């Protein structure tokens, strides 16, 4: 009976990472394709209306968005279906507000207030590295963003590393490597929102993912996925992560 | 149409009853019996997802490559032997595994003319 892509999304079938009343209404905003995945993002309409309360109805929320009063990273977004994901910076210059989108201990997305000096920095985890035409190295980040560097700097970047990029100018500030003693922040799984330092890395045969052991601030050792470990510093977190 | 879906018989030997109509995405197309001729003939086919395929129906030239990487464009005379089918050699039908005779000698095809639109071959030593 299905003949093509879906365009709707019932509230009961909404992702579990949203702070949404699943039974108040029947329909939910189907997220447009964008930077992050479905499970690590929420449409900008929900952030504008439910999370912050700046609007009561979708009509006035759309009017606010069209007036260009909301900024994601450093660029103004007018699409109410635009996804906002992990490590994103939401800026409202008219009120001077800056938030970092982060998961909480039960995997739900929340906005953590930050300062103006921190609002210009967005960490990006290198999801993949490849080559393009002309012998140039292309880096693909956790939010689907891409960067291009010369072959000379091919040894300065590797997968699972973190790049601190200044937005919206898209300039690399520094690179945090993935190694022992590096501060990390777990973004998915059972140990969401937990932070600590790398202890050991275990690799397995076949296509099974690598596992990383992290020691938290209390001395407890817990395991998680290497792709779930997000480097945020060398010895201390370079961004506010509470 | 040329349905390329699931088989109608189980590996044990039982019969399978279709629970749905044939889908457009599971349909193939007629074979392109690329014949040796005097002028090349090719057509463009719009495929799944709006992609493009070049179908070569008549072939008159071939790109024959040697062991040193040198390639020459020559003319096809006849299909000496086609291991794919016992009638292709006598009907002068070029496939991927065919062996052809050109101005420089015997060549073995290495491309798929029905999917490529060109004929490429390697010299036989």
């Amino acid at each position: 009976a299905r003949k093509g892509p879906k365009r709707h999304l019932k509230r009961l079938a909404a992702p579990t990472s949203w702070y949404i009343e699943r039974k108040a209404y029947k329909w939910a905003v189907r997220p447009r394709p964008g930077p992050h995945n479905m499970r690590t993002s929420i449409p900008l309409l929900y952030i504008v209306r439910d999370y912050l309360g700046y609007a009561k109805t979708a009509r006035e929320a759309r009017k606010i968005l069209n007036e260009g009063k909301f900024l994601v990273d450093g660029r103004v977004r007018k699409d109410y279906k635009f996804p906002v994901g992990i490590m994103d910076v939401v800026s409202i210059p008219e009120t001077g507000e800056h938030y970092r989108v982060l998961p909480n201990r039960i995997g739900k997305l929340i906005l953590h207030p930050i300062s103006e000096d921190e609002a210009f920095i967005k960490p990006l985890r290198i999801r993949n590295k490849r080559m393009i035409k002309g012998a140039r190295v292309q880096l693909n980040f956790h939010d689907g963003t891409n960067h291009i560097v010369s072959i000379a700097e091919k040894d300065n970047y590797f997968t699972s590393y973190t790049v601190l990029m200044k937005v919206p100018e898209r300039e690399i500030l520094e690179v945090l490597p993935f190694e022992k003693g590096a501060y990390v922040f777990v973004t998915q799984g059972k140990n969401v929102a937990r932070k600590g330092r790398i202890v050991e890395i275990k690799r397995f045969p076949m296509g099974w993912p690598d596992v990383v052991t992290i020691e938290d601030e209390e001395g407890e050792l817990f395991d998680t996925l290497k792709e779930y470990a997000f480097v945020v510093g060398t010895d201390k977190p370079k961004i506010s992560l509470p | 149409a040329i349905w390329q879906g699931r088989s109608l018989k189980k590996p044990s030997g039982g019969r399978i009853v279709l629970a749905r109509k044939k889908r457009k995405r599971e349909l193939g197309r007629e074979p392109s019996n690329t014949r040796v001729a005097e002028q090349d003939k090719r057509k463009i086919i719009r495929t799944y997802g709006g992609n493009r395929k070049v179908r070569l129906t008549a072939a008159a030239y071939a790109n024959v490559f040697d062991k040193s990487g040198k390639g020459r464009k020559v003319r096809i005379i006849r299909v000496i032997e086609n291991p794919a089918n016992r009638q292709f050699a006598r009907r002068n039908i070029i496939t991927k595994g065919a062996i052809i005779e050109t101005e420089i000698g015997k060549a073995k095809v290495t491309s798929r003319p029905g999917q490529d639109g060109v004929v490429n071959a390697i010299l036989l030593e």
Binding site: Y54, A55, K63, E94 | -
Partner: protein, 95 residues
């Protein structure tokens, strides 16, 4: 009829202020929209032409009624943002 302003919030994206208040009035009917707006304007020095009462709600067996109001900076902004039906209900539009 005593009005207690429980909360005032300043919306700057939409140039308005949102006022949540309560009306204590035992042994009296639910106050009219005109009277509520008049008292609220007299108390908070708001502009009568840019204030709108979203709702006044009464509850079961209660002497207090909840009320929500919005005061906009400009009449043009209020017309642009607010729906037509609420303006008609509050009497700001002759329609």
């Amino acid at each position: 009829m005593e009005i207690r302003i429980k909360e005032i919030k300043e919306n700057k994206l939409i140039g308005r202020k949102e006022i949540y208040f309560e009306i204590y009035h035992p042994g009296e009917p639910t106050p009219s929209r005109k009277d509520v707006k008049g008292k609220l304007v007299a108390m908070l020095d708001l502009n009568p032409e840019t204030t709108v009462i979203q709702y006044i709600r009464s509850y079961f067996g209660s002497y207090i009624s909840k009320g929500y109001a919005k005061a906009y900076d400009s009449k043009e902004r209020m017309l642009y943002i607010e729906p037509e039906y609420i303006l008609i209900r509050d009497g700001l539009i002759e329609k």
